Design a binder for these strands. Structure first.
Lengths: 173, 217, 158, 62
RNA sequence: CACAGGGAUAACUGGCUUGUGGCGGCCAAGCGUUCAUAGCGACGUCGCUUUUUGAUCCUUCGAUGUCGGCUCUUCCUAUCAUACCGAAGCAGAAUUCGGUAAGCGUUGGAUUGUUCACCCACUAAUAGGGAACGUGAGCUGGGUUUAGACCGUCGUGAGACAGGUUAGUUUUACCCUACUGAUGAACUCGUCGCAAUGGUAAUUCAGCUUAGUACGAGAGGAACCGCUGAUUCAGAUAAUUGGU
RNA sequence: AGGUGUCCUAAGGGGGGCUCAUGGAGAACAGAAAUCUCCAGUAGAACAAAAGGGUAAAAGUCCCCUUGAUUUUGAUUUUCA
RNA sequence: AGACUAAUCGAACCAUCUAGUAGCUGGUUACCGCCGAAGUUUCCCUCAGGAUAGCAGUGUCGACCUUCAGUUUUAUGAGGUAAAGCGAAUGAUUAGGGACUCGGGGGCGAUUUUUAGCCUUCAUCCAUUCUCAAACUUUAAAUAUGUAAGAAGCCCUUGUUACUUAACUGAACGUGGGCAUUCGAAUGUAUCGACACUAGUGGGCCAUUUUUGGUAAGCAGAACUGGCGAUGCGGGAUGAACCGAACGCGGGGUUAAGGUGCCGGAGUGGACGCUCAUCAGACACCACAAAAGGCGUUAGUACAUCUUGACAGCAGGACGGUGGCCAUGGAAGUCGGAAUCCGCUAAGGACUGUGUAACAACUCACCUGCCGAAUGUACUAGCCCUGAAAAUGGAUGGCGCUCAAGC
């Protein structure tokens, strides 16, 4: 959907035997903070022996892009579930912000591999600082020197209510 | 007899082993379970491969021997009689019944139809789960390709879907390859017949020293 | 299909593991009065005065006392109505119940705690209340810096 | 020919149709089943305590 | 032999299932002069069909006429023959495996009520099935399945036998639709024409020549064109011959 | 997968002393197996019968005395209206 | 011949008893209003039928009794299922090692053998190892289940008795007195208690989870709850049981399940991808398809090679010891048997083939010249294709649809 990145911090409920427990922080992509908390308890239940009934939420914040007007390359590590077994991939994207790459990745995996949102885990997202660390061949062509190309055969836009045109259109816009 | 295997594929009844309540079950088809040089030391064969199931189904006793023979022949021809050790780790203990409609209820009519339809023993089958190990092979490191091909050839005799996994342990021991190597250097491993035993430092001091002379320096 | 007096009691009436043999002798030194709250628990060793298997686990009220047995009143649920049942049980099977001890403890404390306040002159708020939602507080991160977590990649164990 | 053997499909709903009625508890339970030896003496005890309390108007004044 | 009822319950069709019956795949130990796959395939394993037989009892007991043959139309392809092709442990001849293909054919007799089967003879070939196990107001009535009678085994007896044998009534269309043909109101009565849509048709063999040629040590032994006839089917006609 | 139309003057009641199945080492005839002796032994033995539960100074085993397997009627539990 | 006895015969015809009996078929006559079921328990020569309890209606009385509850919280009891276990008892089961000979079998040093000699094959014992149990177990859930939460309560003092105690020591029932300023968890109370009389019903069926016999079934049999029967309305084209939602007569507004190219009320609406099928595909219950394959296309995992320049293509070379030791009418790399070193270099092997009576010639291997950035092998899963054969003409509902009107 339309996502944005959060940070959420949790803690085990303090007890007389263990005052001042440890603090854990995660980065979660979610449409809103109501489901942002829900994903935090899901990932934590697989790493430590803490539940929601015996825990609490300390703080939830919103992380915004530092430079949302600069073009940069991204790389994503992820795992998912197929119809038989689990797998690991690593894909790359080109855009202006961190949030949209997760949006683009979710739509891409749903089409090419029929993978739903229920069965995808995001491990790490990192912005590629240099130009020699681009691996996949569908992105080197987008960073070639002096890129330029025409746009042949583009259909003109005509109002959907104006039927019965009076002359033949042209496709040389 | 020997109805097609399609008719007894799904685990649909509680386990029905042979006991003092059912009598006269036929003798199962598979007898031998270990083949090859089944007395080599642990240090000789450090590579292990498995054939792991991926469905919750039933495997017939007849199919188990067919796969054992097929894999044994390929390994002997290309790796030698003394270059491997093969073990089958699935034992059939479940008895499947049959209702002989024409043998029991034909010619002389007696009683026909569904009246009194409890059947008689007909064979033995094995129950498997998801992720259960079926066949294991250990050999040298230079025979990795041969071991994989032999297992891939023998899955055509089984119904369903199976996978091939190369284990990260040392032989048949439940220890990581790196971990076992360093523990042996500490003297806490003693040789036995085709297996090993480990030091446990929770007994009287007298015979712990002779059994493990290199542990104490 | 048969229905005997002790049918289906293979595990209910049996003694536990490592508990066969002599009955602890403090059982016969207890005393009972009418109106007490007792609960039934059948002992396998004693073969006299055993109630039916339905009452194994129910709680009742004593209504009669005799030389070596007590009479208990329990309520049985037949379809669409309740019925009063009266049974005779040997003392090896009955046992005093802690069901009402919390109530008897609380009434005694309340009476004394109300008396002292009335002399002093302050409201008590004696009656209990359920758990309430937590209140606001502050947590410091001095020498308790949080650690970041992440999901782990797939790996084969066996 | 053959027919259904037994069922319990609609019995629970039928019972709750107009409540599961619990008999009312009451102050003075009956003394049926109590051993007779204690029952005989208890009769004599109550006979005396009525006469003594009746004499409270021209008598003991305890 | 009778009565009150039952599709709450059997014998026939139809419906779900496919164990048994039939048909088709996958893996490759081996057979195959030597060589797993020219042609086959053990131990195992995945499917399809409803012309076999079972299991079930949903629809009909104020009734759906229950075996076989005769006659006649149409459809399916898992292809016996015919057209054109791909493979071989295919020299020729003769054969075996597979593809596109249902346009066109698939017979005459001895015994049996038979379905099924088995022999003689012709032929390019004498392939397998469906349509309420097609088809009784279309026929026939040999079989089964009322009442007469005989034998064998069983029963003290009346009587029984999916054991053998002989004789035994087959009703109605003029109604609606469907089909094959024939007239026909309205815009004056006529003559000469165009063609939307529906139907559609041909089939196989032999003789002469090619040639005792190609091929082969020999034994054996083809084909294209060309010429002339014949089998099954279809539409007309009556000069001659035959029937009435 | 099995059982019942029975059996008991004790195989019912009270009391007392003792501890079983099995294994190890020993002794003329004596051996795998006959009788005697020592040590270990949680029930792995026994308790009329099918199976389940229960029992060790006993509910097993032997010994001593007996007929509560007797008289008059009520309340309560299981199948259940 | 069970034949004939007035169209009647395995017992004629006429009137009466007679309106003979039926647990079995068929029928049972005006309107409106309110409430509203059962196919289950026990007994019966009972199984197409009755009695009995249940569900239902009507008539009321006692108070408006402040009592109650298909519910939650708090305190405290019971259980042997799912899972788990067998280096823990009973039962089943695969494989080696150590210790033992007098337990059995076959040998050796003279099968000498009463030689605890040397061998060994089973058996035995001990420390380990691979798999199981509806009628096995040391342990042990979730869901459901019993009781209690006070005024009929708590405490003090002391009267009765034929019971009990050595004993006014106990036991029940009592008189008197003390304790609310707050009668001692939440929420609701659109429904409190008792009695009288009686109708219909006692053939049921379907679905989620659990589950028994059977190869399976629109097949037979059970547990908790929701439905049809007894019920319309909007969607699934159609369809007692599926999804939404339950109904007096009308007007305006807003939605649910499902839909917006036309039939058809409302988008040829927006964003990123995948697919070309001479059998495409098109929405749960639901009207079907598998094992095994593809150098069709897309995305991914691991290893190996490369600007010190590979992969493809073309072009140049392709040497000695030495015809090695052997074999021999003849074999010089190339019938055959057995080994595989060194010179020179960037590279050419006592060689992978062709070939000579035997040499030769020739090929391969290997290196070099040209070029300009990628290349090789093995695996995973998306759409598509092969596998894919039935009978009147035919059905994603129809027409039709290709940067879709498909996913």
């Amino acid at each position: 959907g339309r996502l944005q990145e959060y940070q959420v911090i949790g803690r085990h409920l303090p007890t007389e035997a263990n005052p001042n427990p440890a603090l854990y922080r995660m980065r979660i992509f979610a449409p809103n903070e109501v489901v942002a908390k829900s994903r935090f308890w899901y990932f934590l239940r697989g790493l430590k022996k803490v539940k929601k009934a015996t825990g609490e939420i300390v703080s939830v914040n919103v992380i915004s892009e530092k430079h949302p007007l600069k073009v940069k390359n991204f790389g994503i590590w992820l795992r998912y579930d197929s119809r038989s077994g689990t797998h690991n991939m690593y894909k790359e994207y080109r855009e202006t912000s961190r949030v949209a790459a997760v949006e683009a990745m979710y739509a891409d995996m749903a089409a090419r591999h029929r993978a739903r949102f229920r069965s995808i885990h995001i491990l790490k997202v990192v912005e590629l600082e240099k130009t020699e660390d681009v691996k996949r061949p569908y992105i080197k062509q987008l960073v070639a020197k002096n890129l330029s190309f025409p746009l042949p055969h583009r259909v003109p836009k005509i109002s959907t209510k104006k039927i019965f045109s009076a002359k033949r259109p042209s496709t040389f816009s | 007899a020997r109805r097609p295997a399609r008719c007894y594929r799904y685990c649909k009844n509680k386990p029905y082993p042979k006991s003092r309540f059912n009598r006269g079950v036929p003798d199962p088809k598979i007898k031998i379970y270990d083949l090859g040089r089944k007395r080599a030391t642990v240090d000789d064969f450090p590579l292990c491969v498995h054939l792991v199931s991926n469905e919750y189904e039933q495997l017939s006793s007849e199919a188990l021997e067919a796969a054992r023979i097929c894999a044994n022949k390929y390994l002997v021809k290309y790796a030698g009689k003394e270059g491997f050790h093969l073990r089958v780790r699935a034992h059939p203990y479940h008895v499947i019944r049959i209702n002989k409609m024409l043998s029991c209820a034909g010619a002389d009519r007696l009683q026909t139809g569904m009246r009194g339809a409890f059947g008689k023993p007909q064979g033995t089958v094995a129950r498997v789960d998801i992720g259960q190990i079926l066949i294991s092979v250990r050999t040298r490191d230079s025979n990795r390709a041969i071991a994989l091909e032999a297992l891939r050839r023998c899955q055509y005799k089984f119904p369903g879907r199976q996978k091939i996994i190369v284990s990260k342990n040392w032989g048949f021991t439940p220890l990581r390859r790196e971990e076992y190597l360093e523990k042996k250097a500490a003297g806490r491993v003693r040789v036995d017949g085709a297996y090993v035993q480990f030091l446990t430092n929770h007994g009287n001091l007298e015979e712990n020293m002779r059994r493990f002379p290199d542990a104490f320096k | 299909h048969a229905a005997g007096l002790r049918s289906g009691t293979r595990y209910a009436f049996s003694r536990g593991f490592r508990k066969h043999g002599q009955i602890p002798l403090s059982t016969y030194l207890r005393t009972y009065r009418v109106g007490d709250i007792v609960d039934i628990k059948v002992n396998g060793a004693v073969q006299k005065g055993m109630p039916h298997k339905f009452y194994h686990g129910k709680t009742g009220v004593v209504y009669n006392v005799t030389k070596s047995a007590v009479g208990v009143i329990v309520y049985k649920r037949v379809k669409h109505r309740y019925i009063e049942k009266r049974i005779n049980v040997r003392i090896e099977h009955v046992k005093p119940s802690r069901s009402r001890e919390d109530f008897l403890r609380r009434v005694k404390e309340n009476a004394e705690l109300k008396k002292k306040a009335k002399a002093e002159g302050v409201p008590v708020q004696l009656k209990r209340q359920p758990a309430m939602p937590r209140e606001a507080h502050t947590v410091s991160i001095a020498d308790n810096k949080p650690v970041t977590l992440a999901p782990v990649a797939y790996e084969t164990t066996i | 020919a053959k027919s259904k053997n037994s069922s319990q499909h609609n019995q629970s709903r039928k019972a709750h149709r107009n409540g599961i009625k619990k008999p009312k508890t009451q102050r003075y339970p009956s003394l049926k089943g109590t051993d007779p030896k204690f029952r005989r003496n208890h009769r004599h005890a109550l006979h005396g305590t009525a006469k003594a309390l009746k004499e409270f108007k021209e008598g003991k004044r305890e």
